[PDB]
């Protein structure tokens, strides 16, 4: 449903997540041109993105173009592939840079591959409304540049309000790290979040952040930034099996 999400509008029988606000995916006065399967739309800082049309627990792919209006003229700043991983109460976007604006001339594009995680949204779980004991185990996907085959496993101890996970099966060994134990803290809006360190070979290589989503904290979504011998970003999305 690629060419859908871009054209079709949010009607809501659709499975959730249904909408995704683009904030970190598009800057204040910049434009994000998405296209795929004979469809095309433009955004849009704050603009919504119809995800209800996309498939669940999978990566949706679109072609993209990042521009900026300079004197009544749009100037391309970057282009490549836009990725979207949707769940029931959460979702996130990623950018696979295939070409970026030259450093000397504005009108000349250069081939540069970069991967970064954009937005991480959904139905935030209230920190003040988290379970009080027990442990929820979340299984899901870990995806990086040219690899969406990563496996994510994350456990949460609501009593101790701590979390800890693991990344496996990523083509890049240096990315299959451990998500060290981290404390669940309240957001500025009192949304349950989790930030901690990332380890490879019992060695701190970076940090990770997760948001808890769904009224029953059924899901977790965020990203990891890992230092390798060549810094890489990893998209994270996991859910606890349904009853």
């Amino acid at each position: 449903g690629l060419a859908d999400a871009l054209t079709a509008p949010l009607d809501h029988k659709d499975k959730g997540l249904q909408s995704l606000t683009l904030d970190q995916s598009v800057r204040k006065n910049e434009k994000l041109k998405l296209a795929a399967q004979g469809a095309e739309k433009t955004y849009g800082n704050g603009d919504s993105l119809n995800t209800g049309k996309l498939k669940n627990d999978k990566v949706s792919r679109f072609d993209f173009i990042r521009q900026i209006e300079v004197d009544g003229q749009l100037i391309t700043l970057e282009s490549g592939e836009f990725q979207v991983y949707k769940q029931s109460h959460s979702a996130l976007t990623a950018f696979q840079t295939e070409q970026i604006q030259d450093s000397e001339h504005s009108g000349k594009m250069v081939a540069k591959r970069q991967f970064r995680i954009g937005d991480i949204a959904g139905e935030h779980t209230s920190f003040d409304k988290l379970p009080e004991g027990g442990r929820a185990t979340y299984r899901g996907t870990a995806f990086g540049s040219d690899d969406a085959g990563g496996k994510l496993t994350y456990t949460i101890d609501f009593a101790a309000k701590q979390g800890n996970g693991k990344i496996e099966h990523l083509k890049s060994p240096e990315l299959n790290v451990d998500l060290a134990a981290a404390d669940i803290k309240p957001d500025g809006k009192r949304h349950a979040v989790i930030s901690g360190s990332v380890l490879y070979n019992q060695a701190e290589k970076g940090s990770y952040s997760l948001g808890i989503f769904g009224g029953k904290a059924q899901e977790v979504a965020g990203s990891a930034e890992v230092k390798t011998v060549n810094i890489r970003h990893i998209g994270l999305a996991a859910k606890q099996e349904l009853e």
């Binding site: 970026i100 970069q114 309240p186 930030s195 701190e204």
Partner: protein, 115 residues
């Protein structure tokens, strides 16, 4: 390091991270720069590190000035991208009170224009 104030940019996943400052040395986070701004890596985003001497880079976001088309001048530098701090001359067809233009934090100074 306390939560980084970043002029002309900001940290990614700001609200997921904010609660864990001040952070320990060795820490570093991905950040982005605002329109008309780029990191020292040339991109509009890079990573900021917590060092003994505070956050690095010290100037995470830099203004880039695009050299405008000169109506009545030579346009050899037209479309050219310059970093905050550079000065140039305008070979005008016309002129600049006056003649050199610099890429300032707020943009070109003074406005590069002939007549």
């Amino acid at each position: 390091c306390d939560y980084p104030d970043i002029k002309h940019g900001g940290l990614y996943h700001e609200n997921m991270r904010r609660p864990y400052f001040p952070v320990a040395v060795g820490k570093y986070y991905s950040y982005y720069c605002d329109e008309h701004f780029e990191t020292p890596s040339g991109s509009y985003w890079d990573h900021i590190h917590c060092t003994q001497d505070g956050w690095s880079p010290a100037v995470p976001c830099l203004r880039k000035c695009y050299f405008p088309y000169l109506e009545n001048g030579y346009n050899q530098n037209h479309g050219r991208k310059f970093v905050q701090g550079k000065s140039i001359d305008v070979a005008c067809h016309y002129a600049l009170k006056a003649q050199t233009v610099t890429c300032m934090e707020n943009g070109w100074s003074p406005t590069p224009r002939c007549i």
